[PDB]
Each structure stands twice: as C-alpha cells, then as structure tokens.
Amino acid sequence: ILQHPDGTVLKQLQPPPRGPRELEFYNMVYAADCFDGVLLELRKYLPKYYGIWSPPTAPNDLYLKLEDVTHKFNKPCIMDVKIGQKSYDPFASSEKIQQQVSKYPLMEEIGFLVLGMRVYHVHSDSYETENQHYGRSLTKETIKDGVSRFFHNGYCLRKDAVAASIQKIEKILQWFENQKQLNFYASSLLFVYEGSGGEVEVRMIDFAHVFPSNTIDEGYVYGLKHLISVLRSILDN
Ligand SMILES: Clc1cnc(Oc2cccc(-c3onc4ccc(-c5nnn[nH]5)cc34)c2)c(Cl)c1
C-alpha cells in the first residue's frame, strides 16, 4: 500500500493468481452497466475504485487505485481484521490448507484474526503499532483484551468508537445475510477512528480470494457475529 497525497492508495497486484483475481473482483463490482442490486449495495462498504493503474513508462507494473479510507482523519487509528473461519479458498491444495491453518489454527474457533493496528496516543503524541504476530498470539482467553487495545487512547476506552464499529459492522452483516453469490476468504475489515465522537470507518478490503457461490458465506457471518459479540462485551468494561 502506497498512500497518495490525492487521497488514494495504490495497491500493487499480488502475484498470480491472487492479484488478477482481486482486479477482476473490483472490475465486476464497479462494472458501469451492473444493475445487480447485491453488487450495487456492496460498493458502499468497499473503497471507491478508480480502476487499474500503471506508471506511464511501465505498463507491466499493475496497481489498483483505491480510496484511502483513512484520508479524512487527522490522527487515524487503524486496525485490520481478517474475517472468516477459513483463510484458504475452495481450490487450495492439502499443503496450502496446512500452511493457512498453521498461520493461525484458531481461525475456525474465533472466526477472525487481527492483522495489525496503529493506535494514536494523546498523552505521548505518538503511535503504538502491532504487527501480524500480535493477533496470531491471541487466544480465546485474550481476544477481548486483544481487541480492546485498539480503542485505548492512553486516558480512556473509546466506547463511542466501539459502539459505532458495531453499528457499521451490523450493516455489512445485513448485506451478507441478503446475498448468496459471493464467498470471501482471507479478506479483511479496515477499522478507522479519530485519535486526535463516534466518527468511524469500517470497510471491506483485500479480495484476492473471493469466489462465486450458491450459498450463504457462513464462515464470514460467524466471524462478524463473534466480532460484534466481543465489541459488545467491551462496552461493559
Ligand atoms: Cl494495521 C495496518 C493498518 N493499515 C495498514 O496499511 C494502511 C494504512 C493506511 C491506510 C490503508 C488503507 O486505506 N485505504 C485502504 C484501502 C484498501 C487497502 C487495502 N486493500 N488491500 N489491502 N489493503 C488499504 C487501505 C492501509 C497496514 Cl499495512 C497495517
């Protein structure tokens, strides 16, 4: 992810087949002749899509030009949460499934994984960052506190941001409960709130493993529900 001052990010396509698949996903959803009511509603929850981009002197070098979801914030606090029970897709090999499950074997049980967070602290004028190893360390015993960390500004728990996050996730959950045409593996929610009341972004990102389906994305729904339940419990701190 490269942040552009014009308020966009450039995401370089991952190697095949993942990068091409994410390109086709955006192309399908933001197709200018799409009157699919499911896909039209989905746009609300994605970064705005500005199409494929390449450098003027390098058409080989493929990027997606996406809305920077953090742009409108002064001191954005950002958390990426991978959603679902499985982060391997329907066409993974035994070896690939093993790789994905071993990365975080609690995915089936918990239904989400924190990929990282960046939290602005007021009383130090600085950022705390957590990497992939933070979220992969969390167990069922520590997931509530693991998530709570995101909402600590070094003086209070930002229950406004927690409440707002529940409300926005609920809308995404409603979308998933009214579609049976896409299943999403190893995709994420990007949470943003203002670190400098109730001003929040919750957006879906990372679509290298989205597949056509005939059924409810039961794994994604479980993840959303469990995440909402955790956030709800935090409101009682
Ligand atoms: Cl925990 C964490 C949070 N954010 C990260 O990268 C950023 C930082 C600031 C903004 C973004 C961001 O802002 N808008 C975004 C739209 C899409 C993506 C994206 N798509 N696929 N992977 N990332 C990322 C987007 C991403 C990172 Cl690398 C880690």
Q: Which of helix, strand or coil describes residue 146?
A: helix
Q: Per-residue DSSP letters for 150-200? A: GGB-SSSB-HHHHHHHHHHHHHHHHHHTT--SEEESSEEEEEEEE-----E
Crossing angle between the packed helical segments 218-234 and 159-176, to the nearest 10 degrees: 160
- Going by their DSSP bridges, the two strands 76-83 and 63-67 should be labelled as unpaired
Cβ atoms of 209 and 185 closer than 8 Å: yes
Q: Going by C-beta distance under 8 Å and a sequence separation of 6 or more, which residues neighbour residue 52?
A: 23, 62, 63, 64, 65
User: In the PDB record, what is the listed experimental method?
Assistant: X-ray
- Evaluate: CB of 80 within 6 angstroms of ligand 1: yes
Q: Which of 46, 48, 78, 150 to mutate to test the pocket of ligand 1 (most atoms within 8 A of CB)?
A: 78
Resolution of the model in angstroms? 2.0
Which CA distances in Å does 70 have to 137, 168, 190, 228? 26, 16, 9, 22
* Rg (alpha carbons) of the chain, rounded to whole number: 18
- Evaluate: CB of 47 within 6 angstroms of ligand 1: yes
The total of other beta-carbon atoms located within 10 Å of residue 131's CB is: 11
Report the alpha-carbon distance of residue 134 to residue 85 in Å, rounded. Answer: 19
What ranges in 71-179 are assigned the alpha helix state H?
94-103, 107-110, 132-137, 143-148, 159-176
- Evaluate: CB of 9 within 6 angstroms of ligand 1: yes
Give residue 108 CA to ligand 1 midpoint distance, Å.
24
Cβ atoms of 47 and 205 closer than 8 Å: yes
- Going by their DSSP bridges, the two strands 112-121 and 126-130 should be labelled as antiparallel
Report the alpha-carbon distance of residue 86 to residue 80 in Å, rounded. Answer: 17
Give residue 1 CA to ligand 1 midpoint distance, Å.
6
- Evaluate: CB of 116 within 6 angstroms of ligand 1: yes
Q: Which residue's entry shows tokens 């996050």?
A: 165
Evaluate the CA torsion angle 39, 222, 15, 205 in order and state its sign.
positive
Cβ atoms of 101 and 37 closer than 8 Å: no
